[PDB]
Amino acid sequence: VSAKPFMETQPTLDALHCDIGNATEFYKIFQDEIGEVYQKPNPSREERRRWRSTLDKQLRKKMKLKPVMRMNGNYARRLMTREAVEAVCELVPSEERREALLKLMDLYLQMKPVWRSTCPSRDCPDQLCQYSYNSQQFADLLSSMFKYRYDGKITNYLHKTLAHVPEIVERDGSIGAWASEGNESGNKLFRRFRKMNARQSKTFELEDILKHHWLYTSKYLQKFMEAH
């Protein structure tokens, strides 16, 4: 703590992304399972790149997932599936860590929609109840099998999704129900509202922009735009 805060923020998880760090770390894990980190703990500049290439075209063969740069939504969704995990199992030389990471991604699927929910107290209370021991086994496996990497370094996303999620849902009642995403959606309004209904002098421009935006976002005027 080094700066005088002035904005009371409920320090909540952002349900929107909430996943991309987990997915890119599963990517690095699978790339280090094509490689051997716990046999070759000092890979060179290009072993990793060849491993990424064979993994990527391997997925291209089975799951038909062309290479990417960054984990957007749909790519991330398709990457975390039992079938893609058994697909990468084809290439890993040993078969013990095969079943290890299989159970890993299994528990991952079991605990995933717990955070993207709207009210798991009624949508999926089973996954909430099992979540404690679920994430516990998750951490246990990540330590016993993968501690070649998580000795000192962790991505923030991992910590937030492993530590407090059930406590968060208990304290508030949901996770998705406060996603900032909504307001970010609203951006495509503002900019375009600038274009067609300008005034247009900056002393006045905001007046009309705000007027019209508010007009848009009222229950009253939508309740007439029923179209059953």
Partner: protein, 302 residues
């Protein structure tokens, strides 16, 4: 052809079935020839897939409005991004075509709209707020918020506009009064005994927004949304959800309250503008609001 004849010839040739319908209706439906022939022609059209003609006929009888409510008129001006001069030209056209004032003209549309923005729905506060004027009819406040133009100091250049928090809140709540009254209908709770304990949960959001692209680069959009309303009467009542919002992420319900042409990064100007809203929200969580909804004045916490 029968429809090519005169009234005399049609009468002469159809008096037979006229008397048949007469005796049938007097037997069953009290002789109401009007409603009988109406329903008969309707069913005759519906068998021929003529939904359009039958629908317009039923629009001729009970009811026969021709009047478009100025509320929907405004919505359709805005909800589909029609510009204003556009709207006036199209109105002149739809009038000059067919004989009816189907789209209420511009100025009355604006007047009808004016009742919906902030600064029209009176209210009181117990107690009066901290360091806030009791004025309640002030509309769009210039966001600069009284900045001495003297260029000796930090520039007063930054452009921004915003409402007042409380006025926007009373606007949104008088907007949703319909749904809260419907929830009191469903929940079947008392009415003369549900006027004190309302709990409104509100979610804020302030995100950066870059580069409006045109031929004025950065911007912030400080917006909030009603999230849930519950009751506090009368025992422990751990939770009595009057209404939980259904699409809290759908942008269709996320209303803006402040906007500035500042950078997301620099702490200085962002604070210098947002300060007012901070002080409001802080001094707000304590006192309680009194609003006239459904004829009854009722109290609200936050």
């Amino acid at each position: 052809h029968l429809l090519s004849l005169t009234r005399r010839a049609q009468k002469h040739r159809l008096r037979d079935l006229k008397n048949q319908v007469k005796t049938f209706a007097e037997k069953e439906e009290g002789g109401d020839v009007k409603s009988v022939c109406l329903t008969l022609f309707l069913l005759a059209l519906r068998a021929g897939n003529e939904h359009k003609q039958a629908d317009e006929l039923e629009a001729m009888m009970q009811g026969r409005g021709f009047g478009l409510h100025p509320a929907v008129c405004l919505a359709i001006r805005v909800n589909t991004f029609l510009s204003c001069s556009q709207y006036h030209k199209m109105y002149r056209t739809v009038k000059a075509t067919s004989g009816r004032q189907i789209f209420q003209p511009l100025h009355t549309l604006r007047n009808a709209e004016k009742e919906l923005l902030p600064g029209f729905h009176q209210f009181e506060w117990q107690p009066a707020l901290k360091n806030v004027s009791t004025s309640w009819d002030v509309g769009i406040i210039d966001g600069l918020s009284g900045w001495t133009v003297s260029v000796d100091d930090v520039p007063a250049d930054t452009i921004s506009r915003r409402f007042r928090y409380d006025v926007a809140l009373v606007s949104a709540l008088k907007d949703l009064e319909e749904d809260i009254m419907e929830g009191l209908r469903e929940r079947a709770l008392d009415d003369s005994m549900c006027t004190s304990g309302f709990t409104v949960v509100v979610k804020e959001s302030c995100d950066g927004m870059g580069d409006v692209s045109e031929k004025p680069e950065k911007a912030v959009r400080f917006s909030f949304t009603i999230m849930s309303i519950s009751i506090r009467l009368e025992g422990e009542d751990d939770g009595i959800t009057i209404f939980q919002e259904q699409k809290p992420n759908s942008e269709l319900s996320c209303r803006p309250l402040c906007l500035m042409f500042v950078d997301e990064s620099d702490h200085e100007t962002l604070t210098a503008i947002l300060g007012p809203v901070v002080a409001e929200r802080k001094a707000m969580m304590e006192s309680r609001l009194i609003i006239s909804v459904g004829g009854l004045l009722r109290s609200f916490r936050f």
